[PDB]
Amino acid sequence: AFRDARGLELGVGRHAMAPATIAAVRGAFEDRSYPAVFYLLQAAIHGNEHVFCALARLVTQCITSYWNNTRCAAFVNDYSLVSYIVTYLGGDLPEECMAVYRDLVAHVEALAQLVDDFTLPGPELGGQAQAELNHLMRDPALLPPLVWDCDGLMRHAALDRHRDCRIDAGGHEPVYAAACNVATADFNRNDGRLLHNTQARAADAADDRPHRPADWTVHHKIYYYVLVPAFSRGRCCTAGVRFDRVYATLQNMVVPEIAPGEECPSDPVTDPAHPLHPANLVANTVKRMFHNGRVVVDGPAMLTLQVLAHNMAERTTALLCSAAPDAGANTASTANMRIFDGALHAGVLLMAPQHLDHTIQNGEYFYVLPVHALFAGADHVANAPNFPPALRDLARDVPLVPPALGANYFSSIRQPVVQHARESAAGENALTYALMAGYFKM
């Protein structure tokens, strides 16, 4: 009741969301009927901007169907996607869901400029700014749970604080590459290679350089650590994704050949030349997966799904790296301390826990791996393909993060923030400023 009270203190005078754009997103997190093609596309795009504008008709139809299906938005698990839809899909969406996407992005930018209202200026200390010493989210010591590029580790690399980094699939030190092809890919590798191939141009690729400014990863950290516990209320998890299994069904498409001099099919039920006709619904290909979760896709929009061969990633990689306390917290009694942080080099945010569906088997595409207690949905853990039956009591009220990913005491964010997110009675505006102020350092 105190922690919400300073949120209302900060809530006035700066940007507040509509109650429309809250109910659109919070229903999208609690959508137990969620069509799972959006999870495969989230891995298919793999946070690469070039894959987004390639599939732009397919993305804007998957939303427009899902906006005609439900009064919920589609890609609100991935912040890069919510950025790209406002960026590259400004015209061709229904305008009720466009203001939902527009209000959700600027509310992050409201929270980013909350810190700069409070931070006094000064010199640079330990190679860090004044705000990076002040607030956690400007500070690149912490890095978000779901990272696709290598910008998040790069700014964590170039420091006087970092302990070099521990990749763990192969070798201790992480390593970067330029681009990935279908002959270059190794869909289960043990060498710790990190792909930097999320940028705009396929012609422009740099091995040791960032593609994006500092406002890219910070608005990611403000989205995942703050807005995701704000709406979801502790039913969410960040899984590792089998890319070789996900890619195997996307590119497996059955589109019937068009007749010479015939119109493009707009009717999914009536026209046999439509890929969503009942004749074309074949098991284990993508158009029936478009038919399982009911998504209106016409002819060429699933035909531009061949842009996985130009850009794809081989697999996901868990990540655990430490950092020293900063300049300004660095007396010799505290200098031997380490703060362990967990992340995923690829991986999606599961919005709604479900195992009652079996259009996809429980555990084919995703293994749950809660890297953080904020991203530990209990039902995701309690419905793994092997979960021990003696833990059905203990996992119900306790989050489960393995110590390969991090510990509760050695995380950047300890327990009661996870507790405060699921227990607070404030509105999602008033909780957000209550939890945005919780991330000022000590």
Partner 1 sequence: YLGRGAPPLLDNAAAVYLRNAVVAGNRLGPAQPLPVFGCAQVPRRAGMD
Partner 2 sequence: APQFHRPSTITADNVRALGMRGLVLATNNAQFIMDNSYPHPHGTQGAVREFLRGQAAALTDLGVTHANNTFAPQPMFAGDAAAEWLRPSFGLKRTYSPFVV
Partner 3 sequence: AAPAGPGADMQQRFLNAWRQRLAHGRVRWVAECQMTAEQFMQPDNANLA
Task: Give yes or no for residue 131 binding partner 1 (CB under 8 A).
Answer: no
Please list every residue from 265 through 324 that binds its own copies, using CB under 8 A: 293-294
Question: Which residue, chain included where needed, has tokens 């009942």?
Answer: 278
CB 51 within 8 A of CB 81: no
Please list every residue from 100 through 139 that binds its own copies, using CB under 8 A: 102, 104-109, 111-112, 116-117, 119, 121, 124, 129-131, 137-138
Give the Cα separation of 168 and 97 in Å (integer).
Answer: 41
CB 96 within 8 A of CB 51: no
Among 95, 117, 120, 204, binds partner 2 (CB under 8 A): 204
Rounded to 5 degrees, φ, ψ at 249 are -110, -15
Please list every residue from 369 through 388 that binds partner 1, using CB under 8 A: none
CB 175 within 8 A of CB 192: yes
Task: Give yes or no for residue 125 binding partner 1 (CB under 8 A).
Answer: yes
Please list every residue from 212 through 231 that binds its own copies, using CB under 8 A: 213-215, 217-228, 231
CB 99 within 8 A of CB 60: no
Rounded to 5 degrees, φ, ψ at 156 are -75, -25
Among 263, 283, 397, 442, binds partner 3 (CB under 8 A): 397
The nearer residue to partner 3, 170 or 328, going by C-beta atoms, is 170
Task: Give yes or no for residue 121 binding partner 1 (CB under 8 A).
Answer: no
Give the Cα separation of 256 and 278 in Å (integer).
Answer: 12
SS (H, E, C) 271-335: CCCCCCCCCCCCCCCHHHHHHHCCCCCCCCCCHHHCCCCCCCCCCCCEEEEEECCCCCCCCCCCC
The nearer residue to its own copies, 80 or 412, going by C-beta atoms, is 80
* CA terminus-to-terminus distance, the chain: 21
State the nearest-atom distance from the C-beta of 136 to partner 1, in Å. Answer: 18
Please list every residue from 281 through 300 that binds partner 2, using CB under 8 A: 281-285, 288-289, 291-292, 294, 299-300
Give the Cα separation of 17 and 259 in Å (integer).
Answer: 49
Among 38, 75, 79, 340, binds its own copies (CB under 8 A): 79
Task: Give yes or no for residue 213 binding partner 3 (CB under 8 A).
Answer: no
Binding mask 140-169 for its own copies (x = CB under 8 A): x-xxxxx-----------------------
Size of the site for its own copies (CB under 8 A): 107
- Exposure string over 241-270, b if 16+ CB within 10 A, otherwise e: bbbeebbebbeebebbeeeeeeeebeebee
Of the candidates 232, 247, 200, which has an alpha carbon nearest to the alpha carbon of residue 77? Answer: 232
Please list every residue from 244 through 283 that binds partner 2, using CB under 8 A: 244-245, 247-249, 251-254, 258, 264, 269, 272, 278-279, 281-283
Instruction: Report CA dihedral (170, 173, 174, 177) to the nearest 10 degrees.
Output: -90
Pairing of strands 162-163, 318-323: antiparallel
CB 62 within 8 A of CB 97: no
Please list every residue from 217 through 256 that binds partner 3, using CB under 8 A: 240, 242
State the nearest-atom distance from the C-beta of 397 to partner 1, in Å. Answer: 17
From its own copies, partner 1, partner 3, none, which one binds at residue 380 (CB under 5 to 8 Å depending on kind)? none
Helices (H), 70-199: 79-88, 95-115, 130-134, 151-157
**38 burial type by CB count under 10 A (0-12 exposed, 13-18 middle, 19+ buried):** buried
Give the Cα separation of 141 and 152 in Å (integer).
Answer: 9
Give the Cα separation of 81 and 58 in Å (integer).
Answer: 13
Q: Which DSSP letter does residue 439 get?
A: G
State the nearest-atom distance from the C-beta of 344 to partner 3, in Å. Answer: 9
State the nearest-atom distance from the C-beta of 79 to partner 2, in Å. Answer: 20
Task: Give yes or no for residue 123 binding partner 1 (CB under 8 A).
Answer: yes
Size of the site for partner 2 (CB under 8 A): 60
Q: What is the chain's alpha carbon radius of gyration, rounded to the nearest angstrom?
A: 22
State the nearest-atom distance from the C-beta of 5 to partner 3, in Å. Answer: 15
What residue ranges bind partner 1 (CB under 8 A)? Answer: 122-123, 125-126
What residue ranges bind partner 3 (CB under 8 A)? Answer: 117, 120-123, 166, 168-169, 188, 190, 240, 242, 316-318, 320, 367-369, 381, 384, 386-388, 390-391, 394, 397-398, 400, 402-405, 408-409, 414-416, 419, 423
What residue ranges bind partner 2 (CB under 8 A)? Answer: 49-50, 53-54, 56-57, 60, 88-89, 91-92, 182-183, 185-188, 200-201, 203-204, 244-245, 247-249, 251-254, 258, 264, 269, 272, 278-279, 281-285, 288-289, 291-292, 294, 299-300, 303-304, 306, 308-309, 312, 358-361, 364-365
